[PDB]
């Protein structure tokens, strides 16, 4: 018999003590549990009064402006003051940099927001886990709707005497278009911030930390950013684009807007079919149809 017990027995007794002392060293001394619940406050825009203050500032402008480090590198230092949560050593290291020079109605404004760490934490949070910047540019793009759409809701308020069929029939479009954005956002605020955070919070409590984190963010699957369900994402742009055109025409050109809304009701009616056909082939998408459809077809 060849039972190798004289080696592993004085060995395994010491392996568990090192690892348990290695992981414990991270939490009770370097606050690994804090960094996660802090980057979410800033990157994933979980903390209100911050995204509602950052995006609200940038959207006030819209080329050569809004691109030099004198405004965008300073709008952040003005944003954190209006956060009412932060201004800690964690709150720094928010390099609000860019990765493209835009030339000149669309729904795109490319801009990154990268966290920064130091040595004993950089070895765990990978310099590729760059994927937050992938999920961030989507979430910011969503805010562009709930502000521009809020504008036309506020732009129309000052128009009020002027009560006729042309007026009331117009405002029903906004309530019909806003509700679609306020439900797709309610979905995002359920998958990428609450249930995917239930896991990886009751999951943790050294190699595992790398994989557990690589499984938490891999937030990009329930976020409709994966190339597998990409056609579901392509249709979203057609919706977001038409709302932007609806903002341009702030009744000299009513009919020009009436055609726009009819294009909106068609595309939305097409989404409900493309998601249904993609159920036979993903339990994450299952909750979407229950969100987009409720007492309708």
């Amino acid at each position: 018999v060849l039972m190798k017990r004289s080696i592993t027995a004085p060995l395994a007794a010491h392996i568990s003590l090192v690892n348990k002392a290695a992981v414990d060293y991270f939490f009770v001394e370097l606050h690994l549990e804090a960094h996660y619940e802090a980057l979410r406050h800033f990157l994933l825009m979980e903390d209100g009064e911050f995204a509602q203050s950052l995006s609200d500032l940038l959207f006030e402008k819209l080329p050569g402006e809004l691109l030099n480090p004198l405004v965008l590198n300073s709008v952040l230092s003005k944003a954190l003051q209006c956060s009412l949560h932060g201004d800690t050593p964690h709150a720094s290291n928010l390099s609000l940099a860019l990765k493209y020079l835009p030339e000149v109605p669309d729904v795109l404004s490319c801009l990154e927001l990268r966290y920064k760490v130091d040595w004993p934490l950089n070895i765990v949070i990978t310099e590729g886990c760059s994927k937050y910047s992938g999920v961030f540019s989507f979430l910011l793009q969503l805010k562009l709707m709930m502000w521009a759409l809020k504008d036309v809701c506020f732009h129309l308020k000052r128009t009020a005497m002027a009560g006729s069929v042309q007026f009331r029939q117009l405002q029903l479009f906004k309530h019909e278009m806003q509700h679609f954005v306020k439900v797709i956002q309610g979905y995002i605020a359920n998958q990428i911030l609450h249930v995917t955070w239930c896991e990886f919070r009751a999951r943790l409590a050294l190699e595992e930390i790398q994989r557990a984190h690589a499984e938490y963010l891999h937030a990009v699957f329930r976020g409709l950013l994966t190339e597998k369900a990409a056609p579901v994402m392509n249709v979203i742009h057609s919706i977001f684009s038409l709302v932007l055109k609806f903002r341009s025409q702030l009744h000299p050109n009513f009919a020009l807007m009436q055609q726009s809304y009819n294009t909106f009701k068609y595309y939305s009616h097409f989404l409900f079919k493309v998601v249904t056909k993609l159920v036979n082939r993903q339990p994450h998408l299952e909750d979407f149809l229950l969100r987009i459809n409720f007492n309708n077809y």
Binding site: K4, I7, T8, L11, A12, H14, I15, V18, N19, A22, Y25, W119, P120, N122, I123, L206, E207
Partner: protein, 55 residues
Amino acid sequence: RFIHDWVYSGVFRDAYGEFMIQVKLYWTHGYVVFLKHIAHDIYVCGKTINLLKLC
């Protein structure tokens, strides 16, 4: 004795390469009989000690 380094002291000792393991990212100590159930574990049981030495 070589194996008795990464477990107690963490000072990797090499002479001619008899060890199966030789020597930002900081994790480039290339690695690749005895039970493999403990083979890969020794490779990580040392790098942790060599990482706490710099902290």
